[PDB]
Amino acid sequence: MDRPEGSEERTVQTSNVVLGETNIESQDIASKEYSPTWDRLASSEVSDEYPMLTDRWLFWKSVKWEVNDSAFGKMLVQEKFPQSWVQMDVNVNNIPRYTNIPNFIPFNIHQYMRADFEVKIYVNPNDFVSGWLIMAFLYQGSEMFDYKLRRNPAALMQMPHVLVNVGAANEATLKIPYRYVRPFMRCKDILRTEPLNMGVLFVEVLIPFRTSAASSAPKSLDVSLFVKMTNAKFTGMVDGSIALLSKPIALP
Amino acid sequence: MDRPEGSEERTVQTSNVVLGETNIESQDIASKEYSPTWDRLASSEVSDEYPMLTDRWLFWKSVKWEVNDSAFGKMLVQEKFPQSWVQMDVNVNNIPRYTNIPNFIPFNIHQYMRADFEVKIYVNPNDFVSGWLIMAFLYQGSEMFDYKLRRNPAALMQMPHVLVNVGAANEATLKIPYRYVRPFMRCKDILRTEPLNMGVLFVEVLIPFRTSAASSAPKSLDVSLFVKMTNAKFTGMVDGSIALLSKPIALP
Amino acid sequence: MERTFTPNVMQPTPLLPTTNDGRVTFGEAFNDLKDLARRYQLYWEGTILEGNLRAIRRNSALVQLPLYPHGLRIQPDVNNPIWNIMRDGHIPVISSGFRYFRGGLRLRIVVEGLNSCVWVQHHPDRPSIFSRPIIGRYIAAKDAYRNHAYAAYVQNMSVNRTIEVEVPFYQPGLYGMLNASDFTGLGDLLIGIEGEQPIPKEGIEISVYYSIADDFSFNIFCGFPPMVYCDET
Amino acid sequence: MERTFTPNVMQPTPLLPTTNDGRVTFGEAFNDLKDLARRYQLYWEGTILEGNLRAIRRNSALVQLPLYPHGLRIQPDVNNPIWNIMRDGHIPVISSGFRYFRGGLRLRIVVEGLNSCVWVQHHPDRPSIFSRPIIGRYIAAKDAYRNHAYAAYVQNMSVNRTIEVEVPFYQPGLYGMLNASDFTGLGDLLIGIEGEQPIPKEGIEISVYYSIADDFSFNIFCGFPPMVYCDET
Amino acid sequence: MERTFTPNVMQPTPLLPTTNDGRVTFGEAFNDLKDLARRYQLYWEGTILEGNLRAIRRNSALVQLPLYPHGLRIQPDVNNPIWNIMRDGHIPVISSGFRYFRGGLRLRIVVEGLNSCVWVQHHPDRPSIFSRPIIGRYIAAKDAYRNHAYAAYVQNMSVNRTIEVEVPFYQPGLYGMLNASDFTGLGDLLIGIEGEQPIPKEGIEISVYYSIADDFSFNIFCGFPPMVYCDET
């Protein structure tokens, strides 16, 4: 801090959201970015795009991690993705609903979709705590015959990931191009596969979080996650109530 | 720290050694640098140069200094130089030997040498300790009729020196062009003068080292010294065992 | 990119001069895993007895073998000590590092014992329920005999003992899934006799070997799983 | 040069007119030992019985034979009187004069008895402990069955009885050493059955013949060792 | 450079206008210590009595005085109160700041009493054991009389009382060492009578003054030692 206000912050505006970032990010891309071409072969109806709705960034979770519980490779986030982000809004019975959130409003009226994602993670420690986090993404990880051996952070160091150093307190951005076994994903439970299950997003604890022995120091720290879609195309307009959502299955 | 790794470190590579340095140095030259010309008048044999061996940097000592013992002008290092650096490798009887260290391997088989030196000093404190060191060099200081009045740091502030601020934690580089009473120095005890005694290198404690009263704070700090030769020329090839080394004399 | 990112590199020496991936000292260049994955390796090796076949057992299946570019699930019993001390091959190990594929396999089916006209047939979409093969009487009602109009092949074990065929990639989707868990894979491969040659009182010893086709490709590189050293057996 | 040095030559007559190394009177020119060394000669000839094989003895090694461009060490017993009265071949004799080599061998493995699918496989770096082959049950734990991804070959002894393969030169070093004493040589060559055809109650008679490849070369000519005349047997 | 380094200079006013080192107001420029060091100063002052000379004491040394561009070591006795209250001269003080030198001295030897032919002689290499002069009978066997072929000078104290000579720099090495401790220096200077004029019953009062030659130079500036104020005596 040398100015009256601390310093010059940097701004990342998309649609009507604006995200301040004071540090140099840490970026990676889960595979090569491309322009979809065979997706026109799958559906005769025009694919609808909602750039004002879906391009917008969205706050997803806040996960709390404490000094007393940081192993090596303790999972803060282990989620089917985008399934967990899109179905984040639950009613009293924990049944998701695509109606409230304006990014997810088109998932309500369509059957199939396709889009690229960008997950961005934020940690705001003070200067005197030191740790380290890894956030990696595994394409259709849940369907893999050994999915539960790949959760060690030694395995995540290989799949596309970002690192968040808590001593430096940087941002991190993980771009995820759409890749899947079929040119679209289902938005609801139809034709009886889970909806919108493209992979698994992990957040592990690469180096455990450490603070000073002083009593008033923070023993905890927050992690926040923002997500946004990019080339989102929806197809197959139906009624909102023609299909149902059931409460999601969790990973082991 | 604003990046995932802390920041950009700077690298100083010579031969097969590479030394990282994160800060702005503090430099000085003990006298005017020149190209030796009358040295060809002293020896009819070709002077051998070993740039791959001698140009390489070399770790010399680590000296420890504590809070409880920092006067004004307490000497951490008081050494006949290059004598102490070249004879640093002793056997069980404290008799030096030029055979192990690859920089010093040509001192073993030659009688006379000539070369310029560069001494570089490293102190790695945390942020909250403050002190100050002075490292100066006196050409053939030990032979001076009042050598023991010139050890006060008030005298060292005049001869060529560098300063290491412990609050800033900088590097320091002292270049020493070869200057002597004769165009070469002896490498061993021959023709019965001590070998390779070109001066005296001091490290004093200009401002005493101070820390906080807290119990777990470091009460000590390390100082490391690296040295390298530059225009090293050796002459007068003999057997390695034709002359002997005896354990060195220390300064008062 | 965080996977290959190298900050503050301190390198003492120059880099080593290249042999063009071995082409300087040997004659060939080993620059690619896709070429190593086209050297054949064992796929499934079994025996089949009379009496664990069909009742009528004229032209019938002997095996329905599921085509996976990773291996079948291995179990290391004492009969074939290969699967025990050698673990998997180079192909299941290469394959475990990638997520998808698109392309076909080549097979070499060596069915002898028996020495009569044997046949092979590919069911490009009848997948994919299990990680073992299914022998004889246990294959289901409609995979029992030959079918009409599925791509098939026939060979007299008198003329030649080795059937080498190449299975195409016929799927609706974009990719096939490597490392599936258990229409994702290459479907089923049925092997069977053509009309009730009497079976030797011990065994019809079938063994399938496989490789990658030419148009085959591994597609999204994520990690490798944890391995196990073979020399610890 | 002292080896070819000729001081004070006194020659009574002219030199003899040339036939171009025999090409005038025969049709071919015998100007080189490397061409004589490419005519095949016997390498190792043995028999293998059931009961000095493995316990389970499905697809297993029958021999691990060490590839040397000089011969294997010979012992002249009464079973094969070849090695007795013929001594070594022309290849071990040519080879004993040179110090190094660089290049591969060609083999011809004639494995019959048995008449089932037999297999061969080259382990380019697992050398080189001994001058004899190792039969059956005595080959070590990890050379017992086939391996994955080593260059291998397979053949039905029903279709054809002779396997002819060419072994490459895969080594880290500059040369391989001729006349080794006992990674110097060409590694090991494993020969084995593919799945437990019942063995005839006497013998599987294997015999290996070998030659030099095209890129092979003998390299530093020192002397020859002392020889023994064959007509004294 | 750390010696002259000036970080964050805050200067309230301009710099002062120059007088060209005094040449504006006086007539001369005092810009250099080498010019101050060429004004003569006292070097050694002593007395010599008969009876602390030689036995035979014809042409002999009276003093062998060691030539140092710093001074001789001073001792401040009550006989010459110069060395007591004035301390050293300007030359020993200038010299204590530099490490080496290369060049000669100028001397002025005023030897009177005696009034006979006196002589001086320079031994460029017979150095350098001590910081005092040596009087008369205590000079060693081979420095006693004049020598042959050393550069020497002779003068009648009847014609003139002052011998002014300039000593050359003859050394093997690169430098001579200022501030030596105790072939480093300028050698020895011998002063002596030429043949036994009877000595006055008190004293031959010799005094040597010295300066720097023209080619002389101070060479490596390290610090000054700690000083002592003269007004505290």
Automatic annotation (TrEMBL), chains A, B:
Domain of life: Viruses
Location(s) in or outside the cell: Host cytoplasm; Host membrane; Virion
Protein name as annotated: Genome polyprotein
Source organism (scientific name): Slow bee paralysis virus
UniProt lineage: Viruses, Riboviria, Orthornavirae, Pisuviricota, Pisoniviricetes
Range covered out of full length: 177 to 436 of 2964
